[PDB]
Design a protein around this motif. Structure first.
Motif, mmCIF file in Angstrom:
data_model
loop_
_atom_site.group_PDB
_atom_site.id
_atom_site.type_symbol
_atom_site.label_atom_id
_atom_site.label_comp_id
_atom_site.label_asym_id
_atom_site.label_seq_id
_atom_site.Cartn_x
_atom_site.Cartn_y
_atom_site.Cartn_z
ATOM 1 N N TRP D 165 0.787 -1.227 0.000
ATOM 2 C CA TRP D 165 0.000 0.000 0.000
ATOM 3 C C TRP D 165 0.834 1.301 0.000
ATOM 4 C CZ3 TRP D 165 1.932 2.082 4.164
ATOM 5 C CH2 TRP D 165 2.267 1.277 5.271
ATOM 6 N N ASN D 166 2.155 1.210 0.111
ATOM 7 C CA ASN D 166 2.933 2.427 0.310
ATOM 8 C C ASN D 166 3.225 3.151 -1.020
ATOM 9 O OD1 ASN D 166 4.838 0.301 -0.215
ATOM 10 N ND2 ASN D 166 6.334 1.186 1.156
ATOM 11 N N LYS D 189 -2.670 -8.385 -7.823
ATOM 12 C CA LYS D 189 -3.567 -8.003 -6.710
ATOM 13 C C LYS D 189 -2.920 -6.874 -5.908
ATOM 14 C CE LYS D 189 -3.924 -9.078 -2.479
ATOM 15 N NZ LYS D 189 -4.379 -7.884 -1.781
ATOM 16 N N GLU D 192 -5.436 -4.376 -0.529
ATOM 17 C CA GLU D 192 -6.900 -4.205 -0.538
ATOM 18 C C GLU D 192 -7.290 -2.797 -0.087
ATOM 19 O OE1 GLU D 192 -5.128 -6.544 1.186
ATOM 20 O OE2 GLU D 192 -5.710 -6.283 3.270
ATOM 21 N N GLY D 222 -5.720 -10.435 1.184
ATOM 22 C CA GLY D 222 -4.850 -11.609 1.160
ATOM 23 C C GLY D 222 -5.457 -12.807 1.866
ATOM 24 N N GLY D 226 -5.244 -14.794 -1.319
ATOM 25 C CA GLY D 226 -3.784 -14.786 -1.314
ATOM 26 C C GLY D 226 -3.176 -16.143 -1.503
ATOM 27 N N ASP D 227 -3.736 -17.126 -0.814
ATOM 28 C CA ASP D 227 -3.269 -18.492 -0.930
ATOM 29 C C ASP D 227 -3.530 -19.071 -2.308
ATOM 30 O OD1 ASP D 227 -2.178 -18.393 1.717
ATOM 31 O OD2 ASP D 227 -3.530 -19.953 2.446
ATOM 32 N N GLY D 243 5.618 -7.252 3.817
ATOM 33 C CA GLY D 243 6.260 -7.550 5.050
ATOM 34 C C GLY D 243 6.775 -8.972 5.159
ATOM 35 N N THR D 246 4.238 -12.073 5.944
ATOM 36 C CA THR D 246 3.423 -12.505 4.812
ATOM 37 C C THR D 246 4.311 -13.125 3.760
ATOM 38 O OG1 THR D 246 1.897 -10.728 5.250
ATOM 39 C CG2 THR D 246 1.731 -11.791 3.103
ATOM 40 N N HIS D 249 5.052 -16.723 4.629
ATOM 41 C CA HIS D 249 3.858 -17.521 4.435
ATOM 42 C C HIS D 249 3.676 -17.863 2.959
ATOM 43 C CE1 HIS D 249 -0.337 -18.832 5.161
ATOM 44 N NE2 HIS D 249 -0.493 -18.406 3.920
ATOM 45 N N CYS D 298 10.235 0.992 2.170
ATOM 46 C CA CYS D 298 11.058 -0.217 2.334
ATOM 47 C C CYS D 298 12.474 0.150 2.707
ATOM 48 C CB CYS D 298 11.080 -1.046 1.045
ATOM 49 S SG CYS D 298 11.771 -0.174 -0.381
ATOM 50 N N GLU D 399 11.367 -3.684 12.098
ATOM 51 C CA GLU D 399 10.909 -2.682 11.144
ATOM 52 C C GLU D 399 9.574 -2.098 11.612
ATOM 53 O OE1 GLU D 399 9.175 -3.742 7.283
ATOM 54 O OE2 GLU D 399 10.685 -2.364 6.382
ATOM 55 N N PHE D 401 8.228 0.980 10.335
ATOM 56 C CA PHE D 401 7.515 1.408 9.160
ATOM 57 C C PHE D 401 6.647 2.655 9.400
ATOM 58 C CE2 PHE D 401 5.866 0.364 4.845
ATOM 59 C CZ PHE D 401 7.067 0.039 4.268
HETATM 60 N N1 LIG Z 1 8.466 -3.661 1.268
HETATM 61 C C1 LIG Z 1 7.735 -2.613 1.652
HETATM 62 O O1 LIG Z 1 7.931 -1.388 1.102
HETATM 63 C C2 LIG Z 1 6.639 -2.836 2.665
HETATM 64 C C3 LIG Z 1 5.363 -2.427 2.287
HETATM 65 C C4 LIG Z 1 4.297 -2.618 3.155
HETATM 66 C C5 LIG Z 1 4.506 -3.185 4.390
HETATM 67 N N2 LIG Z 1 5.732 -3.580 4.781
HETATM 68 C C6 LIG Z 1 5.852 -4.171 6.137
HETATM 69 O O2 LIG Z 1 4.797 -5.106 6.453
HETATM 70 C C7 LIG Z 1 4.340 -4.910 7.817
HETATM 71 C C8 LIG Z 1 2.888 -5.322 7.918
HETATM 72 O O3 LIG Z 1 2.316 -4.756 6.752
HETATM 73 P P1 LIG Z 1 0.783 -5.002 6.344
HETATM 74 O O4 LIG Z 1 0.222 -6.027 7.292
HETATM 75 O O5 LIG Z 1 0.133 -3.648 6.214
HETATM 76 O O6 LIG Z 1 1.000 -5.612 4.859
HETATM 77 P P2 LIG Z 1 1.641 -7.021 4.331
HETATM 78 O O7 LIG Z 1 3.038 -7.408 4.702
HETATM 79 O O8 LIG Z 1 0.551 -8.075 4.412
HETATM 80 O O9 LIG Z 1 1.529 -6.709 2.770
HETATM 81 C C9 LIG Z 1 0.148 -6.689 2.369
HETATM 82 C C10 LIG Z 1 -0.291 -7.773 1.380
HETATM 83 O O10 LIG Z 1 -0.269 -9.146 1.843
HETATM 84 C C11 LIG Z 1 -1.516 -9.743 1.452
HETATM 85 N N3 LIG Z 1 -1.807 -11.036 2.138
HETATM 86 C C12 LIG Z 1 -2.385 -11.290 3.342
HETATM 87 N N4 LIG Z 1 -2.434 -12.646 3.498
HETATM 88 C C13 LIG Z 1 -1.898 -13.230 2.397
HETATM 89 C C14 LIG Z 1 -1.680 -14.554 1.984
HETATM 90 N N5 LIG Z 1 -2.043 -15.593 2.774
HETATM 91 N N6 LIG Z 1 -1.091 -14.808 0.793
HETATM 92 C C15 LIG Z 1 -0.732 -13.789 -0.008
HETATM 93 N N7 LIG Z 1 -0.930 -12.504 0.351
HETATM 94 C C16 LIG Z 1 -1.505 -12.210 1.547
HETATM 95 C C17 LIG Z 1 -2.532 -8.613 1.645
HETATM 96 O O11 LIG Z 1 -3.802 -8.753 0.977
HETATM 97 C C18 LIG Z 1 -1.748 -7.489 1.019
HETATM 98 O O12 LIG Z 1 -1.915 -7.504 -0.402
HETATM 99 C C19 LIG Z 1 4.538 -3.425 8.084
HETATM 100 O O13 LIG Z 1 4.722 -3.154 9.473
HETATM 101 C C20 LIG Z 1 5.774 -3.114 7.255
HETATM 102 O O14 LIG Z 1 6.911 -3.219 8.107
HETATM 103 C C21 LIG Z 1 6.807 -3.419 3.949
#
Ligand SMILES: NC(=O)c1ccc[n+]([C@@H]2O[C@H](COP(=O)([O-])OP(=O)(O)OC[C@H]3O[C@@H](n4cnc5c(N)ncnc54)[C@H](O)[C@@H]3O)[C@@H](O)[C@H]2O)c1
Lengths: 500, 502, 497, 505
Positions: D165-166, D189, D192, D222, D226-227, D243, D246, D249, D298, D399, D401
């Protein structure tokens, strides 16, 4: 055609030097003709040695200023892409101008313009893709990198047969790499090159980065090849001029890139697709009336189908429609100049005198609408052999020779028995056999079951006396780059070899 | 002792050319006497080949190439053969180094360094041989396959200089063999010894007849055949600019590719924030290794004005102490120059320098010292109070001579350093690495060293901007001089065009 | 056997020393030709594997191998290659003793192994990264390629030393530290190559050999936080498990798993060539080859002719001791492996396939005591069947017919796998069309089996992740760093003052 | 500069699709489920989109497979694929204003940040368009006589692509551009919570024209789809940015069908400031590294390491500047830092303040939601500096964030390297010093995918981006980024085939 002629009333008549459209230093001009009717269609500046020198020095000054040579590769790419888009925007007008100036059919010119757009786009996309290498140094506590820089100032000299195409193959990599350039088109065909300079000026480049000289190679060409400030001379044209340029370039150890003609074999086996082979032998022989660096002038046909081949080819040659490149039913245009038609006619006499047969053509056509123009009939020469001048020498007209061969080995031997090495084809439905032959032909490009294709993704040029270097592809770009090894010693120590 | 051991090697060394698998005399049986520049004594007598011998070698190289025994060998096996040459070099390292010092006069330590370098050059190219046979192209034409194949260029002639005979031979032989070319080499007529030896060693390794050929003789006799024969596909030459230009003009007669490396006027730029005793140390090394007979010798010192007087006096002091002598003596720091003719040329440049208003601060003549009286020695020399307009500053002297010019600014150093016809190599000395990096970017030089002087190696390309040459040796760019590209385009659905009436 | 092994080490090699298992456990190694115990080796523990990984990490950070010059690393890899060739005869015999394959197969492996080490020796110093033309004025951009770090390497029992060489050579060439574990069943040549590498001389901790059952030490080698890349060759089920455990510390994986490799024979093939190559594809190493041509697809117009010709040749295949020069096919590797092959015959018959020849252990007296299984041809098959879809990994081929080129392609691609396969036809244009449409890492035209160091090898689909051999093989063991220097740094001043 | 460029709700959403795009059609969720999208500036519902099902994701994947096997895109010429990718780049630039506004509306970032994103996005598509036709494989010099050996590079096949989302459209571009250039089919995808620019770019790609099933957009959580996207047997590569939890997983799920993974997972990025740095510059860039996009980057410089000599001066200079940072609406030109993305995310950041205090660190400035009336309803969190901390602490290791930096001191170069490398991550970091030789020594020893010397933040299409260690698997951007979407095939032709005659006849 009247449409094309109307294009001329807005075309520049001048050279373009250091950001300005300028006359010749002595105000000399040259009249440009249309080879279809030999009428004077346009008058342009005829520049001098001083003009050529001024352009080279402006190119050097611009290069050292860095405004283009230190621009980002990505941004250079965008500008080259902007030129590609101008070519497309104006493709019909450019095609019309090319047909007017060179005599080839409008369909051939449209095909050229599509290629030209693709050449500029290719090099626009390549501009920012490779800046050199990191090397794992064999010396501890050192860093070793190779940087590619633009070579500097490049002079570019192009021929009359495909003026804007050959110009694009040189301009695109020069601009993409950050070089400054000085270009001179053939004195007899400057129209599309003038037009492309107008289009590049619209795109916008730093003063001195691009320059256009107009004039005779015998007057300004030595300045272009021989000036100390040039870093690379790139020439497309005939072998005798190429050698002259290379010898003059030696005076200042100037790198050369040359593309000269060839004596291109079209090898037709027993098991070829017969109808296809006839079709492609005509195309190889007579597109642009044979005035093609890669023309299939030397047909080699397996002895078992030779009589049947000769008969079919001759029957097709009699049907070839000669006329104005602007008329849709025209299949073959005129040749380029009085001088060039004369060279071709003289070769017919050479052929007969050394014992070859003029099986069809070999003369100017009679027809009333063809009488004012520089037409020469499509020609097939039979009963010849590799000892003959007509077989060995580049005629560069609407003329093919036909020789028989017995074996695959003999086909390879004959095809490679010339001083040249530019391009050629092999026709056979036995692909294994065609590949065996392709890997023994000393030729820059080998087509299997085709004739003519070149494209920006793949390097083009000669083995043997057909040139030095390659244009197009990644090798094409590298001609415009020079390598610098920077080695940093991160723990420098006294050697203490000499006594304190 | 080591000298007499080297002289014993000559009792078993070949006196002949090697043409089409046979050691042969000159067609007219002429011979040439080879001299040791330390004492000017005749040490060996070799065949002096004819233009027809050169012609026969090139024709043998052509026939070998066309037969395909080497050119169709697998790249992996060609690699293994090149490695076997590398292992011969290391096996015979001491004998070869002694032979090199005997022939060229350079110190034994210098020749050992050369042999280590030569082994690594052959080993690099052996490892490169099988690594890239061309590319597959995504064709813009539907129903076609487009591939670029890299093939050996063919027949290559190779002409090498007297300063580093075997090093320069390796830089040419190694990529030629690796790629599948056939070659004809002619070393400098003055210094054939290590090149004859390496031919003996390659013959032991085993190559098809005509793949390698050795011509011995004076360029004025056989040189035009080697650059001008129709059957040569590439001529590669290392030497002076006047011969290089001559070669290029003659190669043009049959549109023959050229690879040239022609020396230089190599700058050594010393900022006032350089490590001062490092810069003095490396100015000496730059100017006087092999008595300055080095393509990359730092003959042109550029030094920031604020330390120019200190630098000059430090450099002069050290030069006075340089030990001249027999290259076989471990105390010798600088050997003789290569020949009578070359020493005269260096002497004539001292006269030019003086007449145009430069100062000979130290050196500038052959030593009178009794121990050096029979050798081809020239004193290490420092020329001051000179400027860029002068012949002595612009022209390659190729002897134990450096000039020192002042500069005020970074900008001025760069303009002085690029103000020659040449562009081979140079150095920048400064603790300020960002500044050294800015200067390196603007120097028109094939190789720039930051806080070093001299290093080259097989992994990186070497050669000139401007009049220092055409092309590169070493690295992947070196290999590519010996390769030619073929585009093979297969139309997999061929159709009649139907342009012309039926 | 005793004569071959009297001087071989029986221990693990951890941090510069040959050591027993921490718990003193041992494992008896069997010759599959006669089922006799021929050697006893240490059976290491999970703590031994941890200790090796930590030594590999310590060595890597010390810089002794990772900061050595690439040219010198290549010289050391070349020295390993030369040891292999020097010891070719004994190594080949050791490989035949351990794996059962013919001595002529084992010689061919040793020659390939020499070439693999010599290829990577020559590649070591050839590419250290890129200079980039930066889109940002007054910056320099360069990409430096570094060794990834600590790599764990797990090899199968079919080609122990070959598979080991594919992993060792690029690891050492790039400057990595490694911990290798051969199949517990087949340690002999891997122990030997560790003795040879030790002789060559590498800094302590750079190379380590663990010996043991994957069930015990395997999760440590896939799962430990200090591992930067896990490289595994073996079966699909273990490979998935490894990937899942590697996820715990976001560890890169390289996997080469099996295949269901098609051998496609058109009616314009050279017939006797196709028969010869179908035999070779099916029955080299008793079919225990990742690229075995287990799935023959033969054009319907010549299917019956082909089946009769192949069966007739299969009845003549000579089974025996790998040390006897007459032997054409050795035994299979273990009791459990032969049992799985046997279970597949029951599966085949129950789903309606025909066992046209073979399908059983031989009862002949000189084969009775070894782990032999007859070369087998299964007919009257189709793509729905387990016997066609699943990797049996024994001296077993299936034969299916196809009508047309498009059917051949659709059948060949109708498996979960994508390792390798072949097309036989005198029409080379047709063979190329088919080759381009097959989802396989390697496609042979008018051949079966060749791989070599110059060219990458690996799967499409469930046959693996990544490539071994070639330049792409090397790149598994490298990581890219972009170093961007701003040569005119200026304040951005986005945030107020 | 890198992340902020100049120009040279009902309105902007009135024409935007609310649906998924599957197999050439704009389509609702299979069960007609929807989701409200909010503007983080005011927490207002701004739009409502389809919320797809597990069966929608499966249908998209099967469509992408069918399209791939048809060859209409995968067998198009590379040059033509490049032309289409450039047509996408051109539509980004044509609609740069609306796209930038949409991105600010959905993510909260300043309009100048969104303009920089759109300029980067254009350049990403343009880079890959130019790369498309430049390397189709290799000819190999075969060690076997009478054989031809070639390596061809083909598209990987069907790829699933999940973005955070960033930087929703920027991350989409890094995935879409190489997939299309190489000839893959894709199913994408977005997060959301931030679908808006991704919907818009699918509208734009549809206008450019691609064969049916080549591109597909799934919208939803997700937890729902997502799965399927990681786990389906027809997927050849799963590409994920987000993150670490995820990502792990996803990798475990991809293993079920031996599917290649490409992961980019954030980091704990060090910003190392030596006492011979340009001080003013180091302060400026510590702020930029810390607080661009409210730290939701990131590569955010969340971990400042400063040399002891200047540590006190540095902390007081930084704190003084942080107090002046202007929070507000990303549409207002004077705003310097926007809100964070979501209630859930702001809660995570706030929780970390109690972690930091409970473990003995100091909240030197910030650490709370702001009170000021126009910020009260939005998802704002103050820029925060945490001092008196060490490498043992969760606040230092993990992290966060958000708009939060920590400051640690070090004495020596060796200590700075030790500390910078003492995290599980390895994405990016910087070194500030006027001693370039020293910066270079440090850069060589940092285990980071990107090291900046006297800068902070820049990435670009010409160079690969990605992690060492737990910051990811593989690289995006550059030639390495293209290569994730390619698979190698060795075609070996025996040109003079002979019977082996191993087995008796
Ligand atoms: N790399 C980056 O620039 C970046 C971006 C966003 C978040 N993050 C990190 O992630 C941490 C948590 O972030 P968040 O919870 O907002 O997002 P996150 O790590 O879940 O990223 C979101 C994505 O994961 C999907 N998801 C959920 N379950 C899934 C599954 N079983 N299979 C596939 N996809 C699935 C969501 O629908 C969404 O599209 C934050 O604290 C941050 O540190 C890093």
């Amino acid at each position: 055609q009247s449409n094309a002629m109307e294009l001329l009333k807005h075309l520049s008549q001048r050279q373009y030097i250091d950001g300005e459209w300028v006359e010749s230093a002595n105000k000399n001009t040259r009249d440009i003709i249309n080879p279809y009717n030999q009428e004077v269609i346009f008058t342009v500046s005829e520049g001098t040695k001083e003009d050529a020198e001024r352009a080279i020095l402006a190119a050097r000054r611009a290069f050292e200023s860095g405004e283009w040579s230190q621009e980002t590769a990505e941004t250079r790419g965008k500008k080259v892409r902007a030129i590609a888009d101008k070519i497309k925007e104006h493709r019909e007008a450019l095609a019309r101008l090319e047909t007017l100036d060179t005599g080839k059919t409008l369909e051939e010119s449209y095909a050229d313009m599509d290629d030209i757009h693709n050449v500029f786009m290719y090099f626009a996309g390549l501009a920012d893709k490779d800046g050199g290498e990191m090397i794992d140094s064999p010396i501890p506590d050192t860093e070793s990198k190779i940087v590619k820089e633009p070579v500097g100032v490049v002079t570019q000299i192009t021929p009359w047969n495909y003026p804007l195409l050959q110009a694009s193959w040189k301009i695109a990599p020069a601009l993409a790499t950050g070089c400054s350039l000085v270009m001179k088109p053939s004195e007899i065909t400057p129209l599309t090159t003038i037009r492309v300079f107008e289009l590049m000026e619209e795109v916008g480049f730093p003063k001195g980065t691009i320059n256009l000289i107009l004039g005779a190679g015998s007057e300004v060409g030595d300045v272009m090849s021989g000036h100390k400030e040039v870093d690379l001379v790139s020439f497309t044209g005939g072998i005798e001029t190429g050698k002259h340029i290379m010898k003059n370039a030696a005076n200042n150890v100037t790198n050369i890139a040359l593309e000269l003609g060839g004596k291109n074999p079209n090898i037709i086996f027993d098991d070829a697709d017969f109808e296809l082979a006839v079709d492609q032998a005509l195309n190889g022989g007579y597109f642009h009336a044979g005035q093609v660096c890669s023309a299939g002038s030397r047909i080699l046909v397996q002895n078992s189908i030779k009589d049947k081949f000769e008969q079919a080819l001759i029957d097709r040659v009699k049907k070839i429609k000669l006329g104005n490149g602007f008329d849709a039913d025209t299949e073959m245009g005129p040749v380029i100049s009085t001088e060039h038609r004369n060279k071709i006619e003289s070769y017919m006499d050479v052929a007969k005198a050394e014992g070859a047969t003029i099986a069809v053509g070999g003369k100017r056509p009679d027809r009333d609408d063809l009488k004012d123009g520089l037409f020469f009939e499509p020609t097939v020469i039979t009963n010849c052999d590799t000892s003959m001048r007509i077989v060995q020498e580049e005629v560069f007209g609407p003329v093919v020779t036909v020789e028989g061969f017995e074996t695959e080995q003999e086909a390879i031997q004959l095809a490679n028995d010339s001083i040249y090495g530019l391009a050629g084809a092999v026709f056979s439905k036995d692909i294994g056999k065609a590949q065996r032959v392709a890997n023994k032909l000393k030729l820059g490009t080998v087509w299997i079951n085709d004739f003519h294709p070149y494209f920006a993704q793949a390097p083009w040029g000669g083995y043997k006396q057909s040139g030095i270097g390659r244009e197009l592809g990644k090798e094409g770009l590298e001609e415009y780059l020079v390598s610098k090894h920077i080695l940093t010693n991160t723990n420098p120590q006294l050697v203490n070899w000499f006594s304190k």
